[PDB]
Amino acid sequence: ENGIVDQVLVTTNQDGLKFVKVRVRTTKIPQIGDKF
Amino acid sequence: PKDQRATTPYMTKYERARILGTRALQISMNAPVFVDLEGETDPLRIAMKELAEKKIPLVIRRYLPDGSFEDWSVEELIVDL
Amino acid sequence: QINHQGEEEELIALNLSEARLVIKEALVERRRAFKRSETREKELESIDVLLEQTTGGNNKDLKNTMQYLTNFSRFRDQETVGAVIQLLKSTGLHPFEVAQLGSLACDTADEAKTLIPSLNNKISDDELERILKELSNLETLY
Amino acid sequence: MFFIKDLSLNITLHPSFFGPRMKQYLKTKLLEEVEGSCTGKFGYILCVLDYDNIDIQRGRILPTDGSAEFNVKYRAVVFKPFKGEVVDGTVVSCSQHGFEVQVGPMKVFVTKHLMPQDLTFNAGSNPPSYQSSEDVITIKSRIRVKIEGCISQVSSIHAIGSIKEDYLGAI
Amino acid sequence: LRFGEMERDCMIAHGAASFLKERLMEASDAFRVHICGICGLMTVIAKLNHNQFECKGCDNKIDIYQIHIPYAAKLLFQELMAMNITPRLYTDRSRDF
Amino acid sequence: SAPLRTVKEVQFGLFSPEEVRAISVAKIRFPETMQTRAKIGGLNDPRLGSIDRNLKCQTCQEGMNECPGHFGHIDLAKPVFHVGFIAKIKKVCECVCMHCGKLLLDEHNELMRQALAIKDSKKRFAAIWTLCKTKMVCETDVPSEDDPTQLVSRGGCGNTQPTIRKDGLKLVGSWKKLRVLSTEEILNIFKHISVKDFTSLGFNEVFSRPEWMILTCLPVPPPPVRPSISFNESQRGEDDLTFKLADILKANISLETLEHNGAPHHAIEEAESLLQFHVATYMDNDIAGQPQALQKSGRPVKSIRARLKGKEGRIRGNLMGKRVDFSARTVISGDPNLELDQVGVPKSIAKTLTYPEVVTPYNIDRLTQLVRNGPNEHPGAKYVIRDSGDRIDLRYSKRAGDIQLQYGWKVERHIMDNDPVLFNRQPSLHKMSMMAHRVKVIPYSTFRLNLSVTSPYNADFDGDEMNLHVPQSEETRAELSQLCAVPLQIVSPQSNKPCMGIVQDTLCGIRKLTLRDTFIELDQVLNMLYWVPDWDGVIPTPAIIKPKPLWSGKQILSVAIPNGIHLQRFDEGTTLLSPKDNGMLIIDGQIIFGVVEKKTVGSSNGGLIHVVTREKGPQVCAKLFGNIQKVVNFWLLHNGFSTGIGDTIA
Amino acid sequence: AGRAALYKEVYNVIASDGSYVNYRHMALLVDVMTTQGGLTSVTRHGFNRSNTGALMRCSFEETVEILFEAGASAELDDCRGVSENVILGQMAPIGTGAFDVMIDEESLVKYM
Amino acid sequence: RLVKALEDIMVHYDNTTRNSLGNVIQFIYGEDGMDAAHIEKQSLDTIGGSDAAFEKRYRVDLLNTDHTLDPSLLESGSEILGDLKLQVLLDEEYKQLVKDRKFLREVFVDGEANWPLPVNIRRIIQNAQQTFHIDHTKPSDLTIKDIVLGVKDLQENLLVLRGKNEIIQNAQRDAVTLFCCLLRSRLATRRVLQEYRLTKQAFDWVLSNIEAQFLRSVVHPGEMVGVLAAQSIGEPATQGVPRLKEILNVAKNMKTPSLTVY
DNA sequence: GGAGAAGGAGCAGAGCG
DNA sequence: CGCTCTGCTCCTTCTCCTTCCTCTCGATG
RNA sequence: AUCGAGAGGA
Ligand SMILES: [Mg+2]
Ligand SMILES: [Zn+2]
Ligand SMILES: [Zn+2]
Ligand SMILES: [Zn+2]
């Protein structure tokens, strides 16, 4: 993987357990072999 | 039964390949070389050169179906490949 | 037995004395290879010289073995060793049984019967009687 | 006792020594590995008869590496004992319970269960020989021992030297 | 990557015995074991620091050989032993000539 | 250390229970595997295949790296049937005299004498079984065939035999006058059968004795066969076998417990069946009947048979085929500028796959530099191995510039140019789908092949993937280059035709290039020649001289073809003038007639490709393909070719 | 006669698709199916029920059912098969392994 | 499934085909011990054509006018004409070819005259013409004696087998029966003089070459023929077909049994 | 579900009484 | 010719049986 | 981690 952190989400379920969701984004630059 | 060997005098390709690979292996082990060096660091190239002019000291043991076998010195064999 | 030459060689029940003499010859051959690269006291020292001129002295145990084998020698002198061979073989004597009589001392036929139970049952006394005293005199010559 | 037999040994050689000198080097290696050998089938191996005429019988090069095997045939002089045999041995070491005697290239242990009941250990002698009966046995003397079976071990081979007999006794 | 059946078939076709062996032995599953000559079962106590070996049930201390086999193969036999099967491996062909 | 050998023959048979007991180094008594980290002496003890960091393995130390496990011992309270042998036991018992130790029939009946004559033991047993199974009585006196009035007092029992029925895990004997047979009875019966009977029955007295079909003790495979499981936070959930063994042990203790405590005859029976059940499912959790052992999780218990039988089992999934290292897989692409026996490999791949090259006086200087470059550069190596086995990792050390190489040391050299490698396109339908090429490293992430090599691979650049394998020993390297090399397969034994050729654009160009009207200005000819790597530096004389120096296309193309070639193809219209310029005729590496097309550079056996392979050898034919493609492509690039809707409009 | 008819019959199938296969590859298959004195199919009930080494047979479609038989008859595989040596991880006796390489020491001492 | 059937089938150094058990399947691989990689389709001239045409193309008579050898063909003209000794040699060959004609009529009942055979004679011959630009306008130095002996001598050197015993020697004769018929077809003296005006030097080269090429083309021992045969049938199958399945599985209950009564 | 093995059941003929 | 015998035929059971990789997803001891 | 199931390529 290679990217930068986009949006870090911290929440909890109904049970009070702490949740963490992290979105990492990157730019796909058409390479040799990429299908079309 | 060296007298009247019933197998070909020609070297079958499998023997060519295996002999070349082996001799390359011994050469890589710093074993004594039997020909002059023209700069072929490639042990396998040394091997083909060696085989071409018959200085391999190897004899092929060919196994017949019954388990009996014949011995063919590489010098005896005809390199037709 | 059979050698690795494909030849069914007979089981060579080698006599102690003839074994020592064959070992002497083999050591002489070994010393020949290195170069190309009798009383029991006389033979004991002579072989030790061969051992020291063919090895480095590490094999002390055998040097003891030959020295002790030479001490219990019965027929040190080979051309006499041949004589007993002809005497014993003329009777069709069994090679394994042959070894003991050539390697062990015995004066009378009965004594051999006592020493070797195998002879006790099937051997002819006359053969032992004539042979053993002939060999006893030969042994006394040593 | 002593036997001449055309025996063979399997020897492996590293490629670097595959020069024509390999014949003599292999001759050596066989000589070291053959002589001074104990074995249940043949007992002990004294020497190699016909030190020349080395039966190399072609080298078996392995596919794993450049190492090759050599089942080199050879005539050797070996020692083989048998049960109930007579040998005029010599006492190598003494013991309160008997003796250990040299029987060819083999070691034989005299056991007190099997010597004349009237013979007793005399610690007063030097060496502490047995002197209570006719069969006086000491390190410096001569002894005949009856081979009451060969007790072959993993590391060495030895047998029982029995003395309680009209023959195969002291000296 | 799984060198599957169809792949080794080609190597058989090409006859690349040396290569086929390398792909199945050196590439993975390399494993050394010791075996008893009396019984062909991997039941050898290998006191390597002592160079001492033995096959309990045969008390054999001289018939010990080193063999290189696929680690998976070792599992198969050991499972066969668990199956009440005796996969005895012998290194000397019964037929001579 | 110990002598090395190789496997020659494998002998199969059944364990002798005393042999099992002797082999085992520990008896198993406790179904319990555990107080916090110590193992019960009666199960999973260090005497077995001890767990990591425990250097016991029955005083074998070495961890689990150089030491396998060892088998345990379980003493069955009662004998039990072996599942795979239930039918075999059934048939055998149908043949024995049922508490006599003898066979129902004898050699005095000619029918068995015919059966006994059978060399094949398997057929022999079946032949006898067909006869004995019909013999429901073992009368002592049997009239002799030679003397009908004389009878042979053979049958010891002299009684009748019951019909045997396979009642699930147990046999039932229907007496012609009915009861459940006893495992003990059968065991004794087998123990009273003679060796001479084994020969007729197809049993080996020293490897396969019929009584051994019945199990009296169970070997206990060590942990390595049922590995300790730590998939979760130190949660065991041991393999099914570990739990399955516990079930047997729990059953074994209970059956023993019941018998000892009060001898509740009936309760003993159910337990014995439970034992026969658990052992049966343990060996095979799949039977013709309903019974299906289930793990506490609710899923079926995975028995030994499940481990082996079926695709992905221990046989097909790990022995005939397996995962391997020193390999790679990616997507391919075309590149005419590469020869048939070549391939493009990304710098990234070569930077990872390595070869264990051996240091010698002939390359120590080169290898020295590679180590200096280290694993970060392409032309370098990852590991330096001393003769002692010191696998130095250049990744985590500055010693790359300090280590002094020594002869005999191994270096994990990166893949470099001209290193033979093996390719494979899944599925490997037939021989051609795997061939050996040469490596040229390139700066992008894909595999480049010469266009022509695709046809045998059945490949296509629409996103197809293809596998790469690298040999590790000099032995194999030589093997591939001489057996699996690309050129060696140009003529396929599939149909006696060349399997390769010019395809796609390059084929189209040649038609135009060799077309009668195609003439080339001097400017182009100068370049086209130079593209031919084999060009000798001698400009051919232009066909047209006076009005303007021109070369007909055929002239240039002939340059690529080596000298000494002679092809003669005649069509219906070929009459040494070819008014349609059909047919084909090449003389001494020079085109004269015809328009070069599919039937001369294609797959056809009469084509040029087939001829060249035989007059010069593949090592020369391979160089041809590059020459043709390099030339035509260059001309086509400067000529161009397209299609469009107009092409379809009439 | 059946062998010939079988070959002729299969030829129609291969030819019907427009593909072409050498006679050598085709005849061999036809021969193998009849060497046992009968039309031995190549299913589980044909080729499998041969007298070849069990360790080879166990990998076709049935594994445990065959192993059990080996123990019953105490089978002794010869290891002459290819797959058998594959399982053991030993060099198969084929191709480059269909012979042996030996060092002709006599020739070695011939070359100084 | 097919591969499993033929894994262990391989060719031994005795030029035979044995399975793992050593059971012999084909005594000589493919009934000719010939590699599939070294064989290509070629014509059999002696099969087709009318009998008179056949005689014209091959028959030579030094005594009569119908099949007179044209003196301009060779440096020796009338020296050859009338020589009964040479006529006998021609008679033997012509009779030999006649047997081949009627013989091959039986082998290939359909009369087809194009079959795979090793060593492409035509290409060797054409190569011969281009080796040193044979001047095809001058008489050659060849003699009938040389041609007839050359043909026979070549045949004696087509050694597929090595066993000196009668049994092996008999097999060798049957192994190359078809191939040697082709040689006697395309090396007939009449053609060797008219169609291909070779020199003595050239003709010696051709015979030497054919033998040399032929030996290279014999199937090598150690081949894993069964695997090659298995795959070779396979890739056809991945392109009728249910029938193939119906064949490999014997399946007595054929879907469409039928008869062809003549 | 097919396909093949398997085992039983009936049955008629062939020899016997 | 009935009896008996035996193979012969028939007639249900009663199994066991099908290229390579890439990700995600929910539930388990 | 496995198993199970699914989606998608070659
Ligand atoms: Mg595609
Ligand atoms: Zn053992
Ligand atoms: Zn262990
Ligand atoms: Zn009975």
Swiss-Prot record, chain B:
Main location: cytoplasm
Keyword vocabulary terms for this entry: Cytoplasm, DNA-directed RNA polymerase, Nucleus, Phosphoprotein, Ribosome biogenesis, Transcription
Start and end residues of each stretch annotated as Leucine-zipper: 37-58
GO BP, sorted A to Z: nucleolar large rRNA transcription by RNA polymerase I; ribosome biogenesis; RNA-templated transcription; termination of RNA polymerase I transcription; termination of RNA polymerase III transcription; transcription by RNA polymerase I; transcription by RNA polymerase II; transcription by RNA polymerase III
Taxonomy, superkingdom: Eukaryota
Family under the similarity heading: Belongs to the archaeal Rpo6/eukaryotic RPB6 RNA polymerase subunit family.
Subunit record text: Component of the RNA polymerase I (Pol I), RNA polymerase II (Pol II) and RNA polymerase III (Pol III) complexes. Component of the RNA polymerase I (Pol I) complex consisting of 14 subunits: RPA135, RPA190, RPC40, RPA14, RPB5, RPO26, RPA43, RPB8, RPA12, RPB10, RPC19, RPC10, RPA49 and RPA34. The complex is composed of a horseshoe-shaped core containing ten subunits (RPA135, RPA190, RPB5, RPO26, RPB8, RPB10, RPC10, RPA12, RPC19 and RPC40) where RPA135 and RPA190 form the DNA-binding cleft.
The protein, known as: DNA-directed RNA polymerases I, II, and III subunit RPABC2
Organismal lineage: Eukaryota, Fungi, Dikarya, Ascomycota, Saccharomycotina
The encoding gene: RPO26
UniProtKB/Swiss-Prot annotation, chain G:
Modification after translation, per record: The tandem 7 residues repeats in the C-terminal domain (CTD) can be highly phosphorylated. The phosphorylation activates Pol II. Phosphorylation occurs mainly at residues 'Ser-2' and 'Ser-5' of the heptapeptide repeat. The phosphorylated form of Pol II appears to carry, on average, one phosphate per repeat. The phosphorylation state is believed to result from the balanced action of site-specific CTD kinases and phosphatases, and a 'CTD code' that specifies the position of Pol II within the transcription cycle has been proposed.
Subcellular localization, as worded in the UniProt entry: Nucleus
Glycyl lysine isopeptide (Lys-Gly) (interchain with G-Cter in ubiquitin) cross-link, chain position(s): K8
S-S bridge residues: none
Similarity remark: Belongs to the RNA polymerase beta' chain family.
Purpose of the protein: DNA-dependent RNA polymerase catalyzes the transcription of DNA into RNA using the four ribonucleoside triphosphates as substrates. Largest and catalytic component of RNA polymerase II which synthesizes mRNA precursors and many functional non-coding RNAs. Forms the polymerase active center together with the second largest subunit. Pol II is the central component of the basal RNA polymerase II transcription machinery. During a transcription cycle, Pol II, general transcription factors and the Mediator complex assemble as the preinitiation complex (PIC) at the promoter.
Domain notes: The C-terminal domain (CTD) serves as a platform for assembly of factors that regulate transcription initiation, elongation, termination and mRNA processing.
Other facts noted in the record for this chain: Mutagenesis experiments demonstrate that the minimum viable CTD contains eight consensus Y-S-P-T-S-P-[A-S-N-G] heptapeptide repeats. Identical and simultaneous substitutions in a number of consecutive repeats are lethal: 'Ser-2' -> 'Ala-2' (14 repeats), 'Ser-5' -> 'Ala-5' (15 repeats), '2-Ser-Pro-Thr-Ser-5'-> '2-Ala-Pro-Thr-Ala-5' (10 repeats), 'Ser-2'-> 'Glu-2' (15 repeats), 'Ser-5' -> 'Glu-5' (12 repeats), '2-Ser-Pro-3' -> '2-Pro-Ser-3' (15 repeats) and 'Tyr-1' -> 'Phe-1' (12 repeats). The binding of ribonucleoside triphosphate to the RNA polymerase II transcribing complex probably involves a two-step mechanism. The initial binding seems to occur at the entry (E) site and involves a magnesium ion temporarily coordinated by three conserved aspartate residues of the two largest RNA Pol II subunits. The ribonucleoside triphosphate is transferred by a rotation to the nucleotide addition (A) site for pairing with the template DNA. The catalytic A site involves three conserved aspartate residues of the RNA Pol II largest subunit which permanently coordinate a second magnesium ion.
Protein name stated in the entry: DNA-directed RNA polymerase II subunit RPB1
Gene name of the record: RPO21
Shown part of the complete sequence: 1343 to 1454 of 1733
